[PDB]
């Protein structure tokens, strides 16, 4: 659980649905990357 996670939400649009690339940039396990998508309202619903 890194604060930089808040920063990832801002660029969530930049990574789009590719949470794997974001996880690689912040080096976080799928749990946090998926959680960030789960918070974004656009990447949540199709
Ligand atoms: Cd998003």
UniProtKB/Swiss-Prot annotation:
Zinc fingers classed as Integrase-type: ranges: 3-44
Superkingdom of the source species: Viruses
Ranges in coiled-coil conformation: none
Residues where Zn(2+) binds: 12, 16, 40, 43
Cellular compartments annotated: Virion; Host nucleus; Host cytoplasm
Free-text note regarding domains: The core domain contains the D-x(n)-D-x(35)-E motif, named for the phylogenetically conserved glutamic acid and aspartic acid residues and the invariant 35 amino acid spacing between the second and third acidic residues. Each acidic residue of the D,D(35)E motif is independently essential for the 3'-processing and strand transfer activities of purified integrase protein.
Function statement: Catalyzes viral DNA integration into the host chromosome, by performing a series of DNA cutting and joining reactions. This enzyme activity takes place after virion entry into a cell and reverse transcription of the RNA genome in dsDNA. The first step in the integration process is 3' processing. This step requires a complex comprising the viral genome, matrix protein, Vpr and integrase. This complex is called the pre-integration complex (PIC). The integrase protein removes 2 nucleotides from each 3' end of the viral DNA, leaving recessed CA OH's at the 3' ends.
Subunit structure: Homotetramer; may further associate as a homohexadecamer. Part of the pre-integration complex (PIC) which is composed of viral genome, matrix protein, Vpr and integrase. Interacts with human SMARCB1/INI1 and human PSIP1/LEDGF isoform 1. Interacts with human KPNA3; this interaction might play a role in nuclear import of the pre-integration complex. Interacts with human NUP153; this interaction might play a role in nuclear import of the pre-integration complex.
Protein name: Integrase
Originating gene: gag-pol
Shown chain mapped onto the complete sequence: 1160 to 1205 of 1447
